[PDB]
Subunit: 23 residues, 4 copies
């Protein structure tokens, strides 16, 4: 989990920014 | 609507990642 | 890796289907 | 174009997952 946090947080952030573009 | 179905799918993908992450964190 | 394969394969497939919808 | 930038972003997300998975598999 510790080694995957940064990668998975970045993926969560990328999806969050994409959702905001649809608005 | 295509845009509405896209928006709902993106919201569902965000939630799928949240649940995957919650499972890895716990534990 | 063994325990995450099914989850990550499903995520890869979901993105693949979404890309196909844009066509 | 919005649709073109969306398509490119989705292609890039697919690739980001492929590279993440390749890193976990190797090893």
């Amino acid at each position: 989990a510790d080694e995957x946090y940064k990668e998975x947080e970045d993926x969560q952030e990328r999806x969050r920014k994409x959702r905001k573009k649809x608005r």
